[PDB]
Design a protein around this motif. Structure first.
Motif, PDB file in Angstrom:
ATOM      1  N   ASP A   1      16.781  18.322  13.177  1.00 38.01           N
ATOM      2  CA  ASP A   1      15.979  17.224  13.726  1.00 38.01           C
ATOM      3  C   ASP A   1      14.488  17.484  13.531  1.00 38.01           C
ATOM      4  O   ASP A   1      13.719  16.543  13.309  1.00 38.01           O
ATOM      5  CB  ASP A   1      16.311  17.003  15.218  1.00 38.01           C
ATOM      6  N   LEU A   4      13.382  16.834   9.903  1.00 36.32           N
ATOM      7  CA  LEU A   4      13.257  15.408   9.632  1.00 36.32           C
ATOM      8  C   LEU A   4      11.910  14.837  10.067  1.00 36.32           C
ATOM      9  O   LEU A   4      11.468  13.831   9.512  1.00 36.32           O
ATOM     10  CB  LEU A   4      14.412  14.638  10.289  1.00 36.32           C
ATOM     11  N   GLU A   8       9.131  13.094   7.612  1.00 37.21           N
ATOM     12  CA  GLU A   8       8.685  11.729   7.906  1.00 37.21           C
ATOM     13  C   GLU A   8       7.151  11.604   7.826  1.00 37.21           C
ATOM     14  O   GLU A   8       6.623  10.730   7.139  1.00 37.21           O
ATOM     15  CB  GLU A   8       9.183  11.261   9.283  1.00 37.21           C
ATOM     16  N   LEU A  11       5.300  11.157   4.462  1.00 32.88           N
ATOM     17  CA  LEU A  11       5.336   9.839   3.833  1.00 32.88           C
ATOM     18  C   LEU A  11       4.174   8.974   4.310  1.00 32.88           C
ATOM     19  O   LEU A  11       3.541   8.287   3.516  1.00 32.88           O
ATOM     20  CB  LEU A  11       6.671   9.107   4.087  1.00 32.88           C
ATOM     21  N   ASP A  12       3.946   8.990   5.622  1.00 29.17           N
ATOM     22  CA  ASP A  12       2.915   8.167   6.251  1.00 29.17           C
ATOM     23  C   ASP A  12       1.489   8.647   5.965  1.00 29.17           C
ATOM     24  O   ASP A  12       0.549   7.868   6.129  1.00 29.17           O
ATOM     25  CB  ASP A  12       3.163   8.049   7.764  1.00 29.17           C
ATOM     26  N   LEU A  15       0.965   6.872   2.776  1.00 23.66           N
ATOM     27  CA  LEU A  15       0.706   5.469   3.122  1.00 23.66           C
ATOM     28  C   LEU A  15      -0.771   5.264   3.381  1.00 23.66           C
ATOM     29  O   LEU A  15      -1.316   4.216   2.993  1.00 23.66           O
ATOM     30  CB  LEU A  15       1.530   5.027   4.343  1.00 23.66           C
ATOM     31  N   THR A  18      -2.934   5.842  -0.025  1.00 24.53           N
ATOM     32  CA  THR A  18      -2.833   4.629  -0.821  1.00 24.53           C
ATOM     33  C   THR A  18      -3.637   3.491  -0.202  1.00 24.53           C
ATOM     34  O   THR A  18      -4.284   2.728  -0.925  1.00 24.53           O
ATOM     35  CB  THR A  18      -1.364   4.168  -0.982  1.00 24.53           C
ATOM     36  N   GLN A  22      -6.790   1.713  -2.088  1.00 23.63           N
ATOM     37  CA  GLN A  22      -6.548   0.305  -2.394  1.00 23.63           C
ATOM     38  C   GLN A  22      -7.665  -0.568  -1.844  1.00 23.63           C
ATOM     39  O   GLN A  22      -8.148  -1.468  -2.534  1.00 23.63           O
ATOM     40  CB  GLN A  22      -5.207  -0.154  -1.831  1.00 23.63           C
TER      41      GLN A  22
ATOM     42  N   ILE B  29      18.311  11.605  15.303  1.00 19.87           N
ATOM     43  CA  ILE B  29      18.267  11.940  13.886  1.00 19.87           C
ATOM     44  C   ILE B  29      18.443  10.696  13.017  1.00 19.87           C
ATOM     45  O   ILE B  29      17.816  10.602  11.957  1.00 19.87           O
ATOM     46  CB  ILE B  29      19.325  13.016  13.523  1.00 19.87           C
ATOM     47  N   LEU B  32      15.432   8.262  13.095  1.00 16.87           N
ATOM     48  CA  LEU B  32      14.395   8.884  12.286  1.00 16.87           C
ATOM     49  C   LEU B  32      14.625   8.625  10.803  1.00 16.87           C
ATOM     50  O   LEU B  32      13.653   8.496  10.065  1.00 16.87           O
ATOM     51  CB  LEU B  32      14.300  10.393  12.582  1.00 16.87           C
ATOM     52  N   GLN B  33      15.892   8.564  10.379  1.00 15.23           N
ATOM     53  CA  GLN B  33      16.240   8.284   8.988  1.00 15.23           C
ATOM     54  C   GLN B  33      15.809   6.881   8.588  1.00 15.23           C
ATOM     55  O   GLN B  33      15.351   6.665   7.473  1.00 15.23           O
ATOM     56  CB  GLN B  33      17.742   8.480   8.729  1.00 15.23           C
ATOM     57  N   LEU B  36      12.234   6.635   7.381  1.00 15.87           N
ATOM     58  CA  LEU B  36      12.010   6.979   5.974  1.00 15.87           C
ATOM     59  C   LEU B  36      12.232   5.759   5.094  1.00 15.87           C
ATOM     60  O   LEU B  36      11.491   5.548   4.130  1.00 15.87           O
ATOM     61  CB  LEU B  36      12.899   8.146   5.508  1.00 15.87           C
ATOM     62  N   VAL B  39       9.144   3.731   5.655  1.00 17.48           N
ATOM     63  CA  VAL B  39       8.012   4.501   5.136  1.00 17.48           C
ATOM     64  C   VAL B  39       8.005   4.572   3.609  1.00 17.48           C
ATOM     65  O   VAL B  39       6.938   4.720   3.010  1.00 17.48           O
ATOM     66  CB  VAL B  39       7.967   5.929   5.718  1.00 17.48           C
ATOM     67  N   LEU B  42       7.251   0.534   2.209  1.00 15.05           N
ATOM     68  CA  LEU B  42       5.823   0.240   2.267  1.00 15.05           C
ATOM     69  C   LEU B  42       5.042   1.020   1.209  1.00 15.05           C
ATOM     70  O   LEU B  42       4.058   0.511   0.676  1.00 15.05           O
ATOM     71  CB  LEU B  42       5.266   0.541   3.666  1.00 15.05           C
ATOM     72  N   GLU B  43       5.485   2.249   0.943  1.00 17.01           N
ATOM     73  CA  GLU B  43       4.840   3.152  -0.003  1.00 17.01           C
ATOM     74  C   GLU B  43       4.742   2.503  -1.383  1.00 17.01           C
ATOM     75  O   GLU B  43       3.679   2.555  -2.017  1.00 17.01           O
ATOM     76  CB  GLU B  43       5.610   4.493  -0.106  1.00 17.01           C
ATOM     77  N   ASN B  46       2.331  -0.550  -1.622  1.00 20.09           N
ATOM     78  CA  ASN B  46       0.959  -0.072  -1.645  1.00 20.09           C
ATOM     79  C   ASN B  46       0.604   0.542  -3.002  1.00 20.09           C
ATOM     80  O   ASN B  46      -0.524   0.355  -3.464  1.00 20.09           O
ATOM     81  CB  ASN B  46       0.684   0.920  -0.490  1.00 20.09           C
ATOM     82  N   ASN B  47       1.535   1.298  -3.585  1.00 19.87           N
ATOM     83  CA  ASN B  47       1.342   1.839  -4.931  1.00 19.87           C
ATOM     84  C   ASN B  47       1.226   0.716  -5.952  1.00 19.87           C
ATOM     85  O   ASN B  47       0.378   0.760  -6.854  1.00 19.87           O
ATOM     86  CB  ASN B  47       2.473   2.801  -5.336  1.00 19.87           C
TER      87      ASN B  47
END
Lengths: 58, 48
Positions: A1, A4, A8, A11-12, A15, A18, A22, B29, B32-33, B36, B39, B42-43, B46-47
């Motif tokens: 956990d 993870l 996470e 990734l942000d 974000l 970018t 941008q 868990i 939280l998946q 992703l 996340v 959106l990635e 934006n790219n």
């Protein structure tokens, strides 16, 4: 956990990276738009001046 | 049938003991998946 949560947040962060670049590109464009838009305004004013000037001479 | 009885009763006790502790941690868990999957989506926009 716990793994993870490390996965996470990564990734942000991208974000945001970018998001910033941008908005930064658009920010540069904005100045260009306002630069030329003025120059076009200058051109049109001069255009209209001739248009009536040439008439009033004739 | 002795095994099925003895073992599956142990399994159901091990399962329900785990489930009580781990269904909460599954949700933790698994929710939280899903983060992703948003996340990421959106990635790309934006790219792009």
């Amino acid at each position: 956990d716990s793994y993870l949560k490390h996965q996470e947040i990564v990734l942000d962060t991208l974000l945001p990276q970018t998001v910033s670049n941008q908005w930064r590109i658009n920010n540069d464009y904005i100045r260009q738009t306002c630069t030329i838009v003025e120059e076009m305004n200058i051109q049109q004013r001069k255009q209209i001046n001739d248009l009536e000037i040439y008439r009033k001479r004739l | 049938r002795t095994s099925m009885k003895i073992q599956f009763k142990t399994a159901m006790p091990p399962t329900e003991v785990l489930l009580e502790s781990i269904q909460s941690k599954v949700e933790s868990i698994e929710q939280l998946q899903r983060k992703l999957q948003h996340v990421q989506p959106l990635e790309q926009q934006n790219n792009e």
